[PDB]
Amino acid sequence: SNPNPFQTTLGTDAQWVVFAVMALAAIVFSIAVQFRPLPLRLTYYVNIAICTIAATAYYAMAVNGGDNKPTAGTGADERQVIYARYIDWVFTTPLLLLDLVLLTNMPATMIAWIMGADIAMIAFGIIGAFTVGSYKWFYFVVGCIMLAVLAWGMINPIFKEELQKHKEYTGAYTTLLIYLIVLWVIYPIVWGLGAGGHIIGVDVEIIAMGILDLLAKPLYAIGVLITVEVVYGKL
Ligand SMILES: CCCCCCCC/C=C\CCCCCCCC(=O)OC[C@@H](O)CO
Ligand SMILES: CCCCCCCC/C=C\CCCCCCCC(=O)OC[C@@H](O)CO
Ligand SMILES: *C/C=C(C)/C=C/C=C(C)/C=C/C1=C(C)CCCC1(C)C
Ligand SMILES: CCCCCCCCCCCCCCCC
């Protein structure tokens, strides 16, 4: 029970690796956008911001994680709480959604509640992360419902023509969004096993979310950027 409940040099090394990749992606996108026509540049800037924020967060986690503070719980159930990741997510997950929202004609009211659910989800996550005992699962479950809500909203332009910008390319939107949803559903599983249940150790949770973050940010960004380039080229 509660195995390996503090970050070690294993977790720290993993964070430095993810830091390096996020920083490199931000730099590469920042140089690339200089060569691209103006209508494409917003999408590059969104992804430059995502990767820059993530690099900053991983720098913070790698430099400070060895302090083995703060913690939640006492005695044998005490476990380190890494909370920088939530500060990352409250800014980057709306930007990740924005990547796809930019490919739609969703009205402002709809974008608003999708983004609102997203921010709520992260908020319930960090509150749950610091909550000792069974009430943590109320936060968890409501956060999971918020993921379902934001996903439902993002799904609607797929089959609602009035929400579509360029219908002939619904396929690219659909594919990117399914990729995003698959990855995002893994995050609460990791949280449930780690921050929530104390079933997996802190280094393991670090590595798992490191892998997810690489897939969900710079690899996802490359997919989005390729999509908007190809679509713009065909218009
Ligand atoms: C122009 C606005 C740009 C967006 C606003 C800033 C975005 C935030 C950037 C990075 C967020 C993650 C860094 C947040 C820093 C977390 C601090 C930490 O890791 O604590 C370690 C513990 O040992 C101490 O208790
Ligand atoms: C659309 C494609 C979706 C792909 C989803 C891939 C999700 C990957 C995330 C997590 C998978 C598990 C990887 C984590 C691998 C285990 C980490 C580990 O063993 O830590 C070392 C310890 O033994 C020492 O303490
Ligand atoms: C780049 C960072 C990403 C894509 C982070 C995504 C995070 C989530 C999808 C978080 C989901 C959560 C729940 C649905 C319930 C509460 C716990 C969270 C915050 C891990
Ligand atoms: C679209 C919402 C999907 C939410 C999926 C949540 C999966 C939760 C799995 C939790 C695994 C850890 C169980 C707790 C062990 C103590």
Ligand SMILES: CCCCCCCCCCCCCC
């Ligand atoms: C949209 C569907 C929401 C599903 C929420 C799933 C929550 C998983 C329950 C984990 C609780 C474990 C308590 C020990």
Ligand SMILES: CCCCCCCCCCCC
């Ligand atoms: C705390 C809320 C942070 C949100 C910052 C990201 C905003 C992304 C733009 C959403 C579309 C308007």
Ligand SMILES: CCCCCCCCCCCC
């Ligand atoms: C040490 C464990 C390595 C796990 C590698 C997972 C990589 C996921 C690739 C998914 C591609 C879509």
Ligand SMILES: CCCCCCCCCC
């Ligand atoms: C009408 C059905 C609404 C279901 C919301 C969940 C969206 C699918 C997430 C996989």
Ligand SMILES: CCCCCCCCCC
């Ligand atoms: C720049 C894109 C990096 C994607 C890395 C995906 C592999 C993660 C497991 C090693």
